[PDB]
A paper describes a structure:
The S. pombe MTREC complex and its human counterpart PAXT target specific and aberrant nuclear transcripts for degradation by the nuclear RNA exosome. The CBC and its partner ARS2 are implicated in fate determination of Pol II transcripts, including their processing, transport or degradation. The Red1-Mtl1 core also recruits the Cbc-Ars2 sub-module, which has been more extensively studied in human.
We also report a crystal structure of the Red1-Ars2 complex, which shows how the Ars2 C-terminal zinc-finger domain interacts with the conserved EDGEI motif of Red1. The S. pombe Ars2 structure consists of four defined domains, including a helical core with an inserted RNA recognition motif (RRM) and is flanked by two extended, mostly helical structures. Ars268–183,206–531 crystallized as a domain-swapped dimer, having the C-terminal leg segment exchanged between the two protomers. Red1 interacts with the Zn-finger domain of the Ars2 C-terminal leg, particularly with the surface formed by α14, β11 and β12. The peptide adopts a U-shape structure bent around the central G34 and establishes hydrophobic and charged contacts with Ars2, burying 300 Å2 of its surface. Red1 G34 and I36 together with aliphatic portions of D33 and E35 side chains pack against the Ars2 hydrophobic surface generated by K473, L484, F485, L486 and  F490. In addition, the three negatively charged residues E32, D33 and E35 make several hydrogen bonds and salt bridge interactions with Ars2 K483, K493, and H494.
Numbering used by the authors:
A (entry chain G): 31 to 37
B (entry chain F): 32 to 37
C (entry chain D): 207 to 358, 362 to 420, 422 to 530
D (entry chain B): 207 to 359, 364 to 530
E (entry chain C): 70 to 93, 96 to 182
F (entry chain A): 69 to 182
Amino acid sequence: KEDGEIS
Amino acid sequence: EDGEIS
Amino acid sequence: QLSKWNQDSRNDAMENTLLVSHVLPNISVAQIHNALDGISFVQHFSLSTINLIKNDERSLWVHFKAGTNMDGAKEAVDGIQLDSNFTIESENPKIPTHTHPIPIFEIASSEQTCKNLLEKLIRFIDRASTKYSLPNDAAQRIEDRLKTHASMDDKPTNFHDIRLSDLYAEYLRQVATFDFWTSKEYESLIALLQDSPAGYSRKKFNPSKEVQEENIWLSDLENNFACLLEPENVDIKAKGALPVEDFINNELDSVIMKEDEQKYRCHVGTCAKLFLGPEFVRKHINKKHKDWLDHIKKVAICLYGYVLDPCRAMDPKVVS
Amino acid sequence: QLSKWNQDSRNDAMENTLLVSHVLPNISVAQIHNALDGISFVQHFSLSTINLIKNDERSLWVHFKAGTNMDGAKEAVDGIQLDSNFTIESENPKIPTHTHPIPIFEIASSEQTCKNLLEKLIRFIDRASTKYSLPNDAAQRIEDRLKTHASMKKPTNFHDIRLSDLYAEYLRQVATFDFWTSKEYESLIALLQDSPAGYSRKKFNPSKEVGQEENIWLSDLENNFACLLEPENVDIKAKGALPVEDFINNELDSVIMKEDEQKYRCHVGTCAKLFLGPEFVRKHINKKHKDWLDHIKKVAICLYGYVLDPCRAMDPKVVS
Amino acid sequence: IDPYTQTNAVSYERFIRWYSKENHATTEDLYNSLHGTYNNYKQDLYARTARSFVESHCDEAWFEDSYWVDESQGRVLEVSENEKSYRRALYDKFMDRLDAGYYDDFQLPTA
Amino acid sequence: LIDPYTQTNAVSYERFIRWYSKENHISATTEDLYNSLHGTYNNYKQDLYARTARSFVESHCDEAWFEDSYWVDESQGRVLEVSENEKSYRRALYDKFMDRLDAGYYDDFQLPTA
Ligand SMILES: [Zn+2]
Ligand SMILES: [Zn+2]
């Protein structure tokens, strides 16, 4: 996951 | 004065 | 004999107003706000623009609240010393008589031009709406009447737009106190009517005496020269391009679509990955979608170059 | 039959030149440089502008050094493979024949316009001198020649028209620039694809007017509207004002005279104080000469406001 | 002498003459040509005189109240709440008139 | 008939007029109108050229010619400067002209009349 990722 | 020459 | 509208404009403009003649250059607006703000039955005051070719004096008009006894008004104002050198002496207000309406040129009544003036008219109505904090439905209501209630050919092909132009113009005379035909604003109706007391007439447009291909050709040519000699002064936006930096920012704003208050998704290629902030997506694009960003960078530059090229190659589809 | 000048142009353009037809879009310039930079008796190559309405193919013209065997040249180039898809086959260069000179509009010959163009022609001569690193006296030499050596012949513009045609002709022959279409070209032959017969002038009948007054009134009125609707977009400099901060900085840049390297004198009224740096003076100005600065920043603000007031009062000296 | 250097406005006729000589004069024709040049000459004249005009009038009360704006010395030029009322009255009169078909038959006269 | 101002394709003056005619309820036989709409059409095209510019650039950007014309970026080893060879070429065209000027080649010269 990357910065701020919200799966 | 400031930065003033004589 | 003055028209109903001109005669009515005249009476309105004078009603519950006093003239104050010989207003000196040294007299300030603050001095006048002193003298008059204290008085309750004064609603507004107007000051003519100085005209030095004639002389140093202006005119001051005091507009009183409706149903003001105008003997009391004089009594209430007469004797007021604005400064040592000027004491107020009111008198009944005047407007130049026995004049002919000022003729507006042929060209103002032509298809092309009339419609330009229409866009300007609308814009001046909206300006006046914001400036004087009025309703924003003036142009709306005017055109609604003009459509619904017709008026009796003897008419040009331009009639609908002239009628409307004429009335948008008349709205600005009465409400804004703007003389569209001179682009002078005024502080009151009486002030405006000093310069256009019979209003304006229209010179009729002759489809025969129309004579402008040559002026288009020249215009376009001089515009081309500018692209080569003064590119920095040319309206890039008008030509459907942007400064590289600006173009690239507009691509980032478009692809970082806001799903919720604190949810911002990537829309670059098939990518639909979400983020909890707008600037969280802006990092993503830098890392993964380099290829795409290079492309945008290249397009931004080339697009700038292209539009500034007088005789560039052109899409076949955009010629006959 | 072709004029000497057009016939001569033709021969000059083709002399020691080879045509390469059917030049594909994918073919880069870098590719062509590789192929020809080595060949010493080649001086220039010139690629045509793609014309996609007609065809996806440009034309490449190879220009050889003076006194070149144009069989040695064909042989030296023929068989060069620029890429897999296009190998070079040289052909004798062509220019479309049996054409009528492209007529320029009447307005180009009118005095007001003829003079604008004259100023634009000079600006393109000078642009060509910097771009191509030529002498800067081309303009002077052409004018001095015509002043000295008269012609055997006529309108009231003649002196200007004559000069304009030669200034236009200079650009055609030297900077390969078709002033009339504002197209730059890479070689004489390339230009002469679109103007092989050159151009002609349609005569100006002074009797003919296009309501010059009307287009002016309308122009002036629109310029006036812009002052109210789009002040930010209006060219303040042209109207004799400066944005406030710039105005002020230009004043300080006048009253600050640097006497050596770290010796800066204040020339505001009866002052002669000296400072290390100019910004040390700019302070001194703020401390000692406040009154003077207060006035300057006042005058800058009003001058801005003034020039943007469409119906401002004006010096009687600048009317009639 | 060159009008483009002088602070005073030269008449359209006197201008023509300077131009006639300056560029080597039927006037008849020139009259119909220099209408625009004279407009641009005046535009230019206005522009370079602009600063002088401000310099002399900047301390006069009439000129300051027009143009002099500065948030540091409380010199704003807002629209008075008094005036806003005055305008809304003129608005409302106009729309009452509109709705009573006052302006149904209205149009600028012809010349 | 549809809004040309929305369409990416160009439209003949004759066809533009007809749209204008119906769009604004103008009872005029197109040659009645021919002189009026010269400017309007010109701006229609300017406006078209404008909003189609980006799409043209996007489709041609990777073609060799288009890159050579417009693509500049020191950072990706692309620029446009006048070849030392061309300066030479142009200088000889100058010197011919001035030799011709001085030899009286252009004394009788003037753009023919129509
Ligand atoms: Zn993504
Ligand atoms: Zn000092």
